[PDB]
């Protein structure tokens, strides 16, 4: 396929523990995990760990509202499955068709941009039922803890940072990375109006702890819509910029080169606020160009890279619409994956203790 | 044509609409009846996210359909 | 199992139309109807009409929120199915353990009453997504038609009224009936604060139209919470009483003999506001003594009559708890019992024909 | 122990509770924070409807569970 999935070392420990728990009869899979396992000929003990994580990632449905529709028990996904799924991020090269503006504020690129998306699921502090695994991880008697949140966002973001550092290294360029207000939307739940500085501080901490591990990540353009002061900051060699699109107008778009970068000197990379249980598109699999996930997945060829089909870009609606062969006969991309039986499974790697992406079995040794 | 909106308050209001009325018009009418500005509104119907610019008939919303009102908020 | 399902002549016409459409592929079943249809081995063309109707009833689920979690298409139940299901009532003999007080205002009966319950699905004017059947039937360009609601509630109530007339006749007694605000709950939806007079007038019209077809229906004790004026009316020999327990102090309970009635001269029957898609008393199948349906199913042995099991009444909470044999192991509700024992909702089905006599479905069909 | 309540404004609030707090005490706290009188409230936890009289311990409501608050009517 055209995408790749990265997980952290601690995520691989999570996976190892869950697999050796399922082998010992010590735990029980969730419903969707079981449905994906049933199609597999092998048992839990027969497959290697890579096939295990692949079948667990395949349990994701194209369109899910994790802030309400998930029970976190056995009905859909057990809590161990959730703590593993939230740490899995997926990157892919994309053709950015507009600047990534929300609603009808998007501006079409006259010559489309070649860049990279990195869907990373933010902290889930919202649910329609019981507590989430992230709620238990980062909350201390309902009080938000900045240290645990830093650890979480590092676990989930550092593999993609390493990957795109290596990509810029191989491209004879540096990396310009745009980051949105990840987890500051519905995922924040009751913490909607306190989470913005927590996310900003988590990002600054990740960057300053690994400034030397990321030699070729040069510009980092971080944009929550509001709730934060505009600022520039030096972190070793990299320039970290907080530029709220709602506060300071004229800010470069999420799918646009930040100030000081251009396709000859930087590769364009955009972190996309993902969730624990949907495909890279989420809302746009249902047809909606809404939320960060949906706007970015719709303004790029994400659906092409995930389904392998060649869609058409509608300039009026700023959309990556399904292929003509399908659309000529309101039918979105989830309709395509349902009608063509397309699944979500790809190559997976983990971040070594040394700091090198490698296969799951290799680093597990 | 009149439709229903299950509002934030938990009750259900009636709304005068036409198939050609865009989701924006529906949001303006919801603002007139309940006060919520359109920029804070998210309309759902049968799980499908209704988005501005599309008309009601673009979503095959019939005579007495009911729309869920959800609080829209910014971020990711 | 000792319940009985009833439906109007119009309901039988709808059922026959749906069956003939299914025989020739003009219509397609719904997920739950087809799921209860595959658990057997006769096609639509072989079985008679009672078994078809009984499988359609069996498509019900012990608890369903008909105003929220139902889609009104193939996902669960289509629209002909919902039109038929709304018109189906059920009745059963019950042991009334308290006066049916809501929440904690119930007074336990020192000597439980031998009475009867008639679950009738009210007019469904609320939906989470899509238009309902009663919405299309009783609304005219958004307005509430009083006459269409009258015809609906007639179709739904008259079989139970004829049956309890016959029941009182076979016991040398008359019939005292207590009725709540049928559609006045969540089912009213957007029409919540206008529907109370419509429901009251529908009851009055049903009583007026068939006062002579109901010789032994004597006292009718209609009781919404509030939103209606206390009144007394002479509908022929019938004493129709509007006494809202929320505005009048000391009102007789719904599972209580109304004033001027006692076990010697009357049989006590209570109408229960039902839904189109659930077993009688769905909120108590989930364990909640909340809606009128749930309170009346919990305060009586309804669960015992539907499951055929022996529960135990609980005075401190006023609820018919599942058998101690099963609840020996958290808060295992009645739904847990029926799920683990695989009980199904299915009973004898009769129809009211042209002459006001309840017969089998095939007999009434010709 | 702290729980969440998805309120009638489309928002989510927090409450300091104890598992020995009765559902009507939780409703009194929700009235404290939002104003809706307890006799107009229905608390839902993951589909199960919560009744005044039994505590959060009897429903096994977890560390940071979220209760839906629904407007409560009387009838059928």
CA distances from C81 to A215, C85, C86, C276, C289 (A): 66, 6, 9, 9, 28
Q: Phi and psi (nearest 5°) for C54?
A: -70, -35
Q: Per the CB < 8 Å rule, is C128 touching B68?
A: yes
How many separate domains does chain B show? 1
CA–CA separation, D21 vs A157, rounded Å? Answer: 41
Is C18:C25 a contact under the CB 8 Å cutoff? Answer: no
Neighbours of D, requiring at least 3 CB pairs below 8 Å, are: A, B, C
Q: Rounded to an integer, what distance in angstroms lies between the CA atom of residue C292 and that of residue C272?
A: 7
Is C137 within 8 Å of C148 (Cβ atoms)?
Answer: yes
Binding-face residues of C in 139-158 toward B, CB within 8 A:
139, 141-142
CB D35 within 8 A of CB A175: no
What is the Cα A256 distance to its own chain's centre?
18
Spatial contact of C248 and C230, defined as CB atoms under 8 Å apart = yes
> Is the alpha carbon torsion for A18, A23, A26, A31 positive or negative?
positive
Burial bucket for residue A295 (CB in 10 Å: 0-12, 13-18, 19+): buried
- The two tokens of residue C359 are 């017969």
For residue C4, give the DSSP letter.
E
Which CATH number characterizes residue D38's domain?
3.10.20.90
Question: Three-state DSSP class for A39?
Answer: coil
Tokens of A3: 């995408």
Q: What is the DSSP string of C91-149?
A: EEEEEEEE---STT---EEEEEEEEEEEEEEPP----SSS--HHHHHHEETTEE-HHHH
Biggest CA–CA distance in chain A, Å, is 57
Best mutation target, D9, D11, D12, to test chain A (most A CBs within 10 A) = D12
Domain that holds residue A204: 4-364
Pair C310, C125: CB distance under 8 Å: no
- Tell me if chain B has a CB within 8 Å of the CB of D12: no
Residue C361 CB-half CA count within 13 A: 23
Cβ pair A28, A303 in contact under 8 A: no
Task: Establish whether chain C is in contact with chain A, requiring a minimum of 3 CB pairs below 8 angstroms.
Answer: no
Residue A238 CA to residue C126 CA, distance in Å, equals 57
User: Alpha-carbon torsion A71, A180, A272, A359, what sign?
Assistant: negative
Distance (Å, whole) CA A314 – CA A217: 33
Interface of C with B in 177-196 (CB under 8 A): 189-190, 192
Give the distance from residue A290's alpha carbon to the nearest chain B alpha carbon, in angstroms.
8
B interface residues, A as partner, C-beta within 8 Å: 42, 47-49, 51-53, 58-60, 73-76
Residues 6+ apart with CB under 8 A from A3: A90, A91, A92, A280, A305, A306, A346
- Which residue from A250, A146, A251, A255 is spatially nearest to A203, judged by alpha carbons? A146
Interface test with B, best of D8, D10, D13 (most B CBs within 10 A): D10
CA torsion, ordered B18, B23, B26, B31, to nearest 10 deg: -170
Judged by CB atoms closer than 8 Å, whether chains meet at D9 and B8 is answered as yes
CA A134 vs. chain centroid, Å, equals 15
Measured at the CA of C3, the angle between CA C202 and CA C262, to 5 degrees, comes to 65
Cβ partners under 8 Å of residue C153, min gap 6: C123, C182, C199, C202, C203, C206
Chain A residue with minimal CA distance to D46?
Answer: A129
Task: Give every CB contact of residue C75 below 8 A, 6+ residues apart in sequence.
Answer: C30, C31
Q: Solving technique for this entry?
A: X-ray
Contact A336, A342 (CB under 8 A): yes
Both structure tokens of C70: 């139902």
Instruction: Kindly state whether C134 is in contact with chain D, defined as any CB-CB distance less than 8 angstroms.
Output: no
- Expressed in Å, this structure's resolution amounts to 3.0
Distance CA A277, CA A275 (A): 6
Q: Residue B58: which of A273, A288, A330 has the nearest Cβ?
A: A330
Q: Given the DSSP bridges, would you call strands C349-352 and D41-45 parallel, antiparallel or unpaired?
A: unpaired
B-contacting residues in A 201-260 (Cβ below 8 Å):
224-226, 246
C-alpha C98/C-alpha C300 separation (Å) is 8
Give the chain B residue whose CA is nearest to the CA of A331.
Answer: B59
Give, for C165, the enclosing helix (H) or strand (E). Answer: helix C146-169
How many domains does one find in chain A? Answer: 1
**C-alpha to C-alpha distances, D68 to A186, A212, B49, nearest whole angstrom:** 16, 47, 21
Annotate C275-310 with DSSP letters as a single string.
-SSB-SSHHHHTT---SHHHHHHHTBTHHHHHH---
- The C-alpha of B35 sits at a distance from chain C's nearest C-alpha, in angstroms, of 18
Q: Which chain B residue has its CA at the smallest distance from D73's CA? A: B11
**Number of residues written out for chain C:** 366
Taken as a whole, chain D contains a residue count of: 76
d(CA D25, CA A196): 33
In this structure, are strands A108-121 and C4-7 parallel, antiparallel, or unpaired? unpaired
A292 touching chain B per CB within 8 A: yes
Show the domain range for B61.
1-76
Q: Is A97 helix (H, G, I), strand (E, B) or coil?
A: strand
| Contact between chains at D11 and B71 (C-beta distance less than 8 A) | yes
Helices (H), chain A: 9-23, 31-38, 49-57, 79-85, 133-138, 146-170, 195-209, 291-299, 302-307, 324-327, 333-339, 360-364
Residue of chain B nearest C135, judged by CA positions: B64
d(CA A274, CA A291): 10
User: Most B CBs within 10 Å: which of A288, A331, A334, as the mutation test of the B interface?
Assistant: A288
> Residue C6 in 3-state DSSP?
strand
């Amino acid at each position: 396929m055209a995408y790749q999935l990265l997980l952290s070392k601690e995520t691989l420990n999570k996976i190892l523990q869950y697999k050796q728990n399922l082998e010992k009869g010590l735990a029980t899979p969730g419903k969707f995990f079981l449905e994906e396992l049933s199609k597999q000929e092998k048992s839990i003990s027969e497959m290697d760990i890579t096939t295990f994580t692949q079948l667990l990632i395949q349990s994701k449905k194209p369109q899910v509202f994790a802030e309400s529709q998930v029970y976190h028990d056995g009905t859909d996904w057990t809590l161990e499955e959730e703590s593993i799924l939230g740490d899995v991020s997926v990157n892919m090269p994309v053709t950015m068709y507009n600047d990534g503006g929300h609603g009808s504020s998007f501006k079409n690129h006259p010559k489309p941009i070649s860049g990279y998306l990195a869907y990373v699921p933010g902290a889930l502090l919202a649910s329609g039922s019981g507590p989430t695994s992230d709620m238990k991880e980062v909350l201390d008697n309902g009080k938000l803890n900045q240290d645990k949140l830093n650890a979480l966002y590092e676990r989930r973001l550092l593999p993609q940072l390493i990957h795109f550092n290596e990509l810029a290294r191989q491209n004879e360029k540096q990396a310009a990375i745009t980051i949105p207000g990840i987890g500051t939307g519905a995922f924040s739940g009751a913490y909607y109006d306190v989470i913005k500085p927590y996310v900003r501080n988590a990002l600054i901490h990740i960057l300053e702890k690994h400034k030397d591990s990321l030699p070729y990540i040069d510009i980092i353009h971080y944009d929550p819509y509001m709730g934060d002061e505009p600022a520039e900051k030096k972190i070793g060699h990299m320039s970290f910029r907080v530029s709220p699109s709602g506060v300071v107008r004229g800010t470069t778009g999420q799918l646009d080169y930040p100030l000081g970068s251009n396709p000859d000197t930087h590769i364009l990379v955009s972190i996309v606020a993902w969730d624990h249980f949907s495909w890279p598109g989420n809302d746009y699999w249902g047809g909606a160009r809404q939320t960060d996930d949906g706007v970015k997945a719709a303004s790029t060829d994400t659906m092409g890279q995930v389904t392998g089909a060649t869609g058409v870009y509608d300039k009026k609606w700023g959309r990556y619409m399904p292929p003509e062969s399908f659309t000529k006969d309101m039918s979105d991309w989830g309709d395509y994956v349902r009608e063509n039986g397309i699944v979500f499974n790809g190559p997976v790697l983990a971040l070594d203790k040394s700091g090198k992406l490698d296969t799951l079995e290799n680093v597990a040794s | 044509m009149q439709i229903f909106v299950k509002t934030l308050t938990g009750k259900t209001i009636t709304l005068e609409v036409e198939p050609s009325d865009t989701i924006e018009n529906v949001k303006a009418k919801i603002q007139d009846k309940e006060g919520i500005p359109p920029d804070q509104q998210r309309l759902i119907f049968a799980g499908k996210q209704l988005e501005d610019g599309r008309t009601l008939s673009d979503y095959n919303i019939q005579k007495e359909s009911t729309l869920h009102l959800v609080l829209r908020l910014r971020g990711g």
